[PDB]
Design a binder for this molecule. Sequence first.
Ligand SMILES: C=CC1=C(C)/C(=C/c2[nH]c(/C=C3N=C(/C=C4\NC(=O)C(C)=C4C=C)C(C)=C\3CCC(=O)O)c(CCC(=O)O)c2C)NC1=O
Ligand SMILES: *[C@@H]1O[C@H](CO)[C@@H](O[C@@H]2O[C@H](CO)[C@@H](O)[C@H](O)[C@H]2NC(C)=O)[C@H](O)[C@H]1NC(C)=O
Ligand SMILES: *[C@@H]1O[C@H](CO)[C@@H](O)[C@H](O)[C@H]1NC(C)=O
Ligand SMILES: *[C@@H]1O[C@H](CO)[C@@H](O)[C@H](O)[C@H]1NC(C)=O
Ligand SMILES: *[C@@H]1O[C@H](CO)[C@@H](O)[C@H](O)[C@H]1NC(C)=O
Lengths: 98, 42, 147
Amino acid sequence: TTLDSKTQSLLIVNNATNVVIKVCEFQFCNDPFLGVYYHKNNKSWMESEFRVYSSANNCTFEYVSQPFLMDLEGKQGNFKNLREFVFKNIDGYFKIYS
Amino acid sequence: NLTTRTQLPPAYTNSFTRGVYYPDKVFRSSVLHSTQDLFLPF
Amino acid sequence: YLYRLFRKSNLKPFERDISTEIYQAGSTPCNGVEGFNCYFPLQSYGFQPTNGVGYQPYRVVVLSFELLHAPATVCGPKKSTNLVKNKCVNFNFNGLTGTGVLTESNKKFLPFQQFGRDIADTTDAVRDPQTLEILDITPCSFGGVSV
Ligand SMILES: C=CC1=C(C)/C(=C/c2[nH]c(/C=C3N=C(/C=C4\NC(=O)C(C)=C4C=C)C(C)=C\3CCC(=O)O)c(CCC(=O)O)c2C)NC1=O
Ligand SMILES: *[C@@H]1O[C@H](CO)[C@@H](O[C@@H]2O[C@H](CO)[C@@H](O)[C@H](O)[C@H]2NC(C)=O)[C@H](O)[C@H]1NC(C)=O
Ligand SMILES: *[C@@H]1O[C@H](CO)[C@@H](O)[C@H](O)[C@H]1NC(C)=O
Ligand SMILES: *[C@@H]1O[C@H](CO)[C@@H](O)[C@H](O)[C@H]1NC(C)=O
Ligand SMILES: *[C@@H]1O[C@H](CO)[C@@H](O)[C@H](O)[C@H]1NC(C)=O
């Protein structure tokens, strides 16, 4: 609603290993992101920075699925895939269709 | 904070025949079912 | 044990609200602190052990569910039996109670689907709980009879 830790807030994030869903009183920064960082010793791109929220407290629901490895490297060319989702919020249920 | 920005007017696109989801969890075949719900207009 | 004394609007069903912003009873905002005409939205109950019946703490639980439309995971206390096939019984597939002969089928059920309904909206395809397989149902009082 306000996204300033005065009210609850849902947060869905794949951090390249798992998907985490947190409903927790985040105090967000103005420009959240994920920092992928590139290594020169090997041609491997990896996530390094997680600066979405400045805090997390007073919170009830939290889910983390199984781990998975995904190719977050820089792929050059056309978009080789499409992903569509629909989010609804009906009577206390947040429905995600994929 | 990130400041290397270049704002542009909001770009628009025509979305057509998109935003249809299975409205329930029941198997149903060879049926012209009709529903009323929150759907993305064509 | 606390309850939300003030909110600027009522809730929707099954919605939680753990906010603590000061509720501006008056028209003048008081910048989120306590004062006059703007009150703390939560109030604590007083549950003395020797206070009236209407003030005694009551424990409430609400079991909310939806019946016979999705793959069941919770089951009742009833012990299963062995189905009698090609003959009509008082079957019970994850709760439904009907009557009719059963038969095998080869329909391609999606994983999140567990029932299958025909044009008449009655059950024409079912998945057996213990054995993962797709079946179909027909009645047994069928066929016209002329005399
Ligand atoms: C962030 C939340 C998130 C959700 C809700 C999610 C759902 C999700 N993604 C899947 C596949 C997959 N999803 C992706 C990629 C993605 N799909 C996404 O929603 C996102 C954000 C990415 C990555 C940026 C890939 C690569 C696969 C499997 C291989 C493929 O489909 O190409 C599957 C099918 C799993 C299976 O049946 O084996 C689910 C349920 N994945 C997630 O990371
Ligand atoms: C959900 O959040 C929004 C805003 O965070 C609420 O909408 C506001 O409600 C207050 C009074 O309750 C009004 O003064 C504002 O004008 C409303 N703003 C908007 C954009 O609607 C909304 O009430 C909340 N939903 C519920 C059920 O309480
Ligand atoms: C990032 O993924 C790792 C490995 O699955 C997981 O342990 C961690 O919880 C995730 N990050 C956060 C903030 O949860
Ligand atoms: C909310 O967080 C603050 C600080 O952690 C704490 O004082 C307060 O008790 C918390 N309220 C709830 C309902 O958790
Ligand atoms: C800069 O960062 C601080 C805290 O991270 C934040 O309060 C402020 O809004 C940010 N300003 C801009 C222009 O991003």
